[PDB]
């Protein structure tokens, strides 16, 4: 029941994701090495991982149909506001419900609650992030749904600082209609509505995690000792 336009959107988003997400995690070898002894020994490594991820998210975004047709300032506000959410979302692909960690091809590049702690984040945030990862994994999303959800996340008309909310909504609506139809092609009612509703609740949760973080990254990076351990792109993006 997917039209050609809908199929073309999915195809573009699959390519973009495949181009910007290397399931071998080979590039990780070029980050500052992880250290698990040392206040914030994991901060250099995870800062490099976050920074790299921001670059990749930007790459994915630029391929979202219509995104690059937005103004430069709208593209920036959208990316600054969504980066962390898309990172979290995209990270579900490495996440495993075995031990509740992100497994990027080895023990050295396998990240757990304590690793994240040693990057300067409290368990109080870290735990809701793990829970989110669990809930998302349980959806057993198809890659088609996964990339649509990332794209919906980025092109949200309700992000602070957006000027042409209507244009951003026009893109988002096409993506949401594509996702809904794809879901319908896989699942009759009411399973279809159930799954969609859960995907929407995941985007709400990400907003919440985003808000909560901003307050935390404000106190972490406020410290000059910490901010110095980050990267230029991370400073630019997270203000």
């Amino acid at each position: 029941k997917l039209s050609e336009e809908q199929q073309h959107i999915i195809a573009i988003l699959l390519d973009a994701h495949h181009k910007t997400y290397d399931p071998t995690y080979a590039d990780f070898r070029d980050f500052r090495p992880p250290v698990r002894m040392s206040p914030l020994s994991m901060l250099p490594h995870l800062a490099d991982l976050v920074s790299y991820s921001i670059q990749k998210v930007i790459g994915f975004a630029k391929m979202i149909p219509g995104f690059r047709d937005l103004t430069s300032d709208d593209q920036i506000v959208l990316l600054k506001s969504s980066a962390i959410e898309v990172i979290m979302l995209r990270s579900n692909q490495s996440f495993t419900m075995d031990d509740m960690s992100w497994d990027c091809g080895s023990q050295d590049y396998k990240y757990d609650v304590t690793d994240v702690s040693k990057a300067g984040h409290t368990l109080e945030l870290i735990e809701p992030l793990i829970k989110f990862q669990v809930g998302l994994k349980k959806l057993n999303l198809h890659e088609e749904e996964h990339v649509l959800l990332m794209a919906i996340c980025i092109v949200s008309p309700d992000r602070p600082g957006v000027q042409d909310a209507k244009l951003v909504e026009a893109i988002q609506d096409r993506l949401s209609n594509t996702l809904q139809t794809y879901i319908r092609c896989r699942h009759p009612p009411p399973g279809s509505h159930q799954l969609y509703a859960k995907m929407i609740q995941k985007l709400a949760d990400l907003r919440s995690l985003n808000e909560e973080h901003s307050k935390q990254y404000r106190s972490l990076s406020f410290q000059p000792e910490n901010s110095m351990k980050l990267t230029p792109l991370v400073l630019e993006v997270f203000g």
């Binding site: 930007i58 430069s72 920036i76 630019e236 203000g239």
Partner: peptide
Amino acid sequence: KNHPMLMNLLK
């Protein structure tokens, strides 16, 4: 503020 690196990654 200015975002020269994000701008550059977008073009």
